[PDB]
Amino acid sequence: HDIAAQHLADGIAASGPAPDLAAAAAFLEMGDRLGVVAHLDPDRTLETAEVAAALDLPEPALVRYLDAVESAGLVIREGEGRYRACPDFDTIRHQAGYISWTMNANRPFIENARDFFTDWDKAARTHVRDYREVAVSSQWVGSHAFYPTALATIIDAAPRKVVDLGAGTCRLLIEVLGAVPGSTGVGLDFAADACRAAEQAVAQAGMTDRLTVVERTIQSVATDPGVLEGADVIHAGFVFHDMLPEEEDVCDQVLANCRESLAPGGFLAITDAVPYLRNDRERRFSAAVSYYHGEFMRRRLQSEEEWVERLRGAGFSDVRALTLAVPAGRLFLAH
Amino acid sequence: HDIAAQHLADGIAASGPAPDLAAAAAFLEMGDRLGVVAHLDPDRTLETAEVAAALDLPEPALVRYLDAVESAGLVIREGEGRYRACPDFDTIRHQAGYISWTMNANRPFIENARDFFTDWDKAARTHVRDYREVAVSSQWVGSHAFYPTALATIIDAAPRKVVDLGAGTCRLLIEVLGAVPGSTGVGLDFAADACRAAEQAVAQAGMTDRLTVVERTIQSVATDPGVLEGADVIHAGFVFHDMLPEEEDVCDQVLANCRESLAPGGFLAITDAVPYLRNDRERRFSAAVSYYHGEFMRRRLQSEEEWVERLRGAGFSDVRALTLAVPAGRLFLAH
Ligand SMILES: Nc1ncnc2c1ncn2[C@@H]1O[C@H](CSCC[C@H](N)C(=O)O)[C@@H](O)[C@H]1O
Ligand SMILES: Nc1ncnc2c1ncn2[C@@H]1O[C@H](CSCC[C@H](N)C(=O)O)[C@@H](O)[C@H]1O
Ligand SMILES: O=C(O)C(=O)CCc1ccccc1
Ligand SMILES: O=C(O)C(=O)CCc1ccccc1
Ligand SMILES: [Zn+2]
Ligand SMILES: [Zn+2]
Predict the structure, then answer these.
(1) Is B326 touching A (CB cutoff 8 A)?
(2) DSSP-assigned letter for residue B301
(3) Is B61 on the interface with A (CB under 8 A)?
(4) In chain B, which residues have their Cβ closer than 8 Å to the Cβ of A27?
(5) Considering every ligand atom, which ligand is closest to the CA of A243?
(6) Whose CA is closest to atom 8 on ligand 4?
(7) To pair with B63 at 20 to 30 A between CA atoms, which of A303, B125, B223, B277?
(8) In sequence order, what E strands does chain B have?
């Protein structure tokens, strides 16, 4: 009875916040694949009758899920068939983003590393990531750890036209357009799955007519820059690396094109990841992002120095790097 | 520059320990599937030359993985081709256990919930869990959150024979046998994949000749109790529920058989999960364990009361329940 109590206290300390985070991540990924999570908000209610119908789910099954999440403490039952997210839901979801990204989006790397180590080319085409999961997990991380700084920079200098390259689910644009009343946005992304997710999200935010989703590669922009011109700000979050080190020249043409297409006041903003940081706070997640990129995707992440170097030798001036909350995340501003 | 710093501090607080945990879980699951993690220990070294050969991996690929984990802060490079785990590695691995269990072992439930909601029978046979992942993730959680109390109870009363039903990777037995010099163990488990993992682990701990792994169902024990008799302690961790509510009678025969086969001093110890706790600490992970069991596996988790009730109406006396560190985990001792 003594040592049971001691084993209890010691175990609770060892486990720390991991039980809570493991449970939230699983409930939220499952609910997001169902389409339920888009209906969860601490300030709005989810009416099961309508949502079950909208999502084409048996209402009873939705109720059993929601009751499970209610037991977990992630939602509150407001009345019969009405639920709302717990007050700290957005932070819970943000943290789940990291877990979803490493454990869900990048699962093919985790499961099939042996293949990647022995025959990379065969592995790379056999074990492919689900870009809907890449884009969503990225959005959950972004909400609190990389969107806010870029949002605030974009909001000042009050743009009329914003282009986001490799936009994923288009959350940053939805946010920009929400904050500056007379703005248009174009979100560009190579993945059908991301684009479908985005169009849905954009519609859900009532901006379908203000914010266009165009399914194209960023490479496209080098030869067909007929999407940039008019833009006060061009943004690119975690995409530029997708053409390094293999398409260096294309990258430099996209950069040259960006410089041109800009209104005379505006800027390019690049959110991207720098490789293998050593500082205590950033190092562990930095290493995961770097290893997935380096080893599995064979994309080159550049250092701060290299990025600054490149934006200059692309004809941008006043280029600086800002530290983001997401480990090894950096914001580059090039005017 | 002001608001970048403010967005930084706010983002770091929002993210909390999630970046670190997400990265550790992914590195460790990946490394455990490779067979590397069994070689990681804060007190021993991993010699890449031998391990790469033992694991049938290109040594250079192992080195690149280990260097990534070193950058992450999870291993320390001792010299060329020598590495050891960071000092707090066991706690890191324990926490990764929770993430692995919810996000890896139970992945088929996360990805295919829609199917489970619409046609359960078809879903249950189409989307099946990898029991090697179930057993390993369970072991990582157990290390600090459910093995210690059962270990300490077993170690007292110094047994000669211990049987563990649904033993997974047999860590509890390996630990019991390690602490009481003249003990034999039998670990029983229905999953080939778990048994293979176990035999390997048992061999790695030099107990192959002391600890037998028998691939059988727990149901087996109802009709063929020729595995129990002689036992000072019978243990069963997170298996009993696998015959409820459908094989109630079989469960009661296994229980009756257990009562008989015991030496006159010994006891049955059951580690198992109670459903949907409400207390703040346990509720969130409790709900995940309960929802996976209830909804996806259709196994009945019993409350403390029900379990105590059952162990009595099986002819055990002096039955009590102890709180474990793993949320909604309970240890039942029946003599
Ligand atoms: N060559 C390419 N051209 C355009 N988009 C690309 C690309 N390679 C990858 N992408 C997209 O880039 C995104 C990377 S992650 C999502 C990033 C998003 N801007 C955000 O910050 O939340 C994915 O949506 C992926 O589909
Ligand atoms: N009907 C059954 N008979 C025997 N073992 C079973 C079973 N159903 C599931 N199992 C096994 O029970 C285990 C549940 S999880 C692992 C539990 C292990 N005792 C531990 O505490 O770490 C798995 O190894 C699974 O393969
Ligand atoms: O997945 C990719 O391809 C990326 O570029 C990852 C983008 C990212 C970076 C940090 C946290 C979450 C998401
Ligand atoms: O996966 C199963 O079937 C189980 O019974 C899970 C056993 C378990 C319980 C709590 C944490 C980790 C593992
Ligand atoms: Zn990337
Ligand atoms: Zn179970």
Answers:
(1) yes
(2) P
(3) yes
(4) 287-288, 291
(5) 1
(6) B138
(7) A303
(8) 46-47, 75-79, 82-85, 161-165, 184-188, 211-214, 233-237, 267-273, 320-323, 329-334
